[PDB]
């Protein structure tokens, strides 16, 4: 009875684990977002290719 | 005097909490970045709609 | 012999440190992704500027 230790909750004290996974899936949301964006950009790429063939 | 325990700093040993919030706000920075990007893409969408009406 | 404490591994219990750095470099991957996207958008910006000068 002297040197006692409290409850060491490593899985609770953190609480960021759920955040890590969330943030991960978040970027994936943007990664795909850029993909869709990139698509519209494929349009402009063609818009200035043949679409502008008229002169 | 035998089984002693050191200082268990759960809020210090981590040090990632500040990083989690930072990374979170970071994606938000990109999420909005895609939004602005998406805007320019709205342009190309119209560029090939009426803008190319000339033939 | 009474109040004993187990092995408190703060650097092991976490295991998210490697994830934090990974996610960080991940966004950077998108940040640059938006940059390249933004580029194609510079095109559409010009596509509707002089490219459409024809009427």
Swiss-Prot record, chains A, B, C:
What's the superkingdom here? Viruses
Heptad repeat 2, as annotated region: 7-46
Residues annotated as glycosylated are 2, 17, 38
Coiled-coil residue spans: 19-47
Task of the protein: Acts as a viral fusion peptide which is unmasked following S2 cleavage occurring upon virus endocytosis.
Q: Report the protein name in the record.
A: Spike protein S2'
Record the organism.
Answer: Severe acute respiratory syndrome coronavirus
Q: What is the phylogenetic placement of the source species in the record?
A: Viruses, Riboviria, Orthornavirae, Pisuviricota, Pisoniviricetes
Q: Its gene?
A: S
> Which part of the full protein is shown?
1140 to 1193 of 1255
């Amino acid at each position: 009875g002297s040197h006692t230790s409290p409850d060491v909750d490593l899985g609770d004290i953190s609480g960021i684990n759920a955040s890590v996974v969330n943030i991960q899936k978040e970027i994936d949301r943007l990664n795909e977002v850029a993909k869709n964006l990139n698509e519209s950009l494929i349009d402009l790429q063609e818009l200035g290719k043949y679409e502008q063939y008229i002169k």
